[PDB]
A and B are shown apart, each in its own frame.
Chain A
Amino acid sequence: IVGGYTCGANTVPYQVSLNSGYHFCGGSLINSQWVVSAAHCYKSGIQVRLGEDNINVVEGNEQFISASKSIVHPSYNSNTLNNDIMLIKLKSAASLRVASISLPTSCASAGTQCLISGWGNTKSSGTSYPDVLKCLKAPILSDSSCKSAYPGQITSNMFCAGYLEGGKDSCQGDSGGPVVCSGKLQGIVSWGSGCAQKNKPGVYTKVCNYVSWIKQTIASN
């Protein structure tokens, strides 16, 4: 998160860290046994870390749980990045500092806003990964401006959020993290052109289009 602020210990209870010997992606707890993240975060040997603030030191409120299953959307396209969503089943249920986030009943409109969080890079030009969780409030942008920023790359399953001036954005290490609006999970950190660059807002997976797929998939696995 570039241009954000320190959230504060466990103030974002649904935020999880995907660990493969080091933090590589974020995710959101949507059930005591299920986590939602990005399809491009798929990796074997994933350990999910819950109740984390400082990802580098054990503070006592954590729960490290291995994933038993990782279901990437059947229509995920690694080239166009369309359908960049994945579900991870925890080997055992988490003890709900730790809480799930609600799935949306409806899609959010431009102007809404949202809270984006993660442990990704905090510098636009350079590298600086934080210890604690960073937060950012950014508004959802209109489909047209999003499409103007990334010609022929935006599908109906993606939405832009951020600022055209630049300086505030998600960045490497934030992928799979939550974009929560009005207490509902509206997006998943996905891609962008660089970080916090002018006229290049971040792109996110539009969660409202997958709610029925998510509910049915959780229930039959």
Chain B
Amino acid sequence: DFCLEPPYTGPCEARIIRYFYNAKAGLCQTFVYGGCRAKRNNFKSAEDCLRTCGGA
């Protein structure tokens, strides 16, 4: 379940704000994504995040 994986910033240096599902808190939180090599628990909006991972 990719929804249970920790957020992945990646090797690139950008400071792009994305969302990830935090199974412990039961909600989607923001994190800094570097711009490349994104894993699946990485969404552009809280809505996309909740629709895909909400309640996992």
Give chain A's interface residues, CB within 8 Å of chain B.
22-25, 38, 40-41, 43, 78-79, 81, 120-121, 129, 170-176, 189-193, 202
Contact = CB atoms under 8 A, between A and B. Distances in A.
A40 B35 contact: yes
A40 B36 CA distance: 6
Contact of B13 (A78, A79, A192): A192
Interface size class of B (residues with CB under 8 A): 10 to 19
Interface string B1-39: 000000001011111110000000000000010111100
28 contacts: A23-B15, A24-B14, A24-B17, A25-B14, A25-B35, A40-B14, A40-B34, A40-B35, A43-B16, A78-B37, A79-B37, A120-B13, A129-B15, A171-B13, A172-B9, A172-B34, A175-B12, A175-B34, A175-B35, A176-B14, A189-B13, A190-B12, A190-B13, A191-B11, A191-B13, A191-B34, A192-B11, A202-B13
A173 B15 contact: yes
Nearest to A170: B13
Contacts of A193: 11
Contacts of B12: 38, 40, 81, 175, 190-191
A133 to B, nearest CB: 15
For A24, A40, A170, A190, which residue has the most chain B Cβ atoms within 10 angstroms? Answer: A40
Nearest to A173: B15
For B13, B34, B35, which residue has the most chain A Cβ atoms within 10 angstroms? Answer: B13
Q: Can you list the 5 inter-chain pairs with the closest CB atoms, starting with the nearest?
A: A173-B15, A40-B35, A175-B13, A175-B14, A191-B11
A136 to B, nearest CB: 13
Contacts of B15: 22-25, 120-121, 129, 172-173, 175
Contacts of B37: 78-79
For B9, B11, B34, B35, which residue has the most chain A Cβ atoms within 10 angstroms? Answer: B35
Contacts of B16: 24, 43
B50 to A, nearest CB: 21
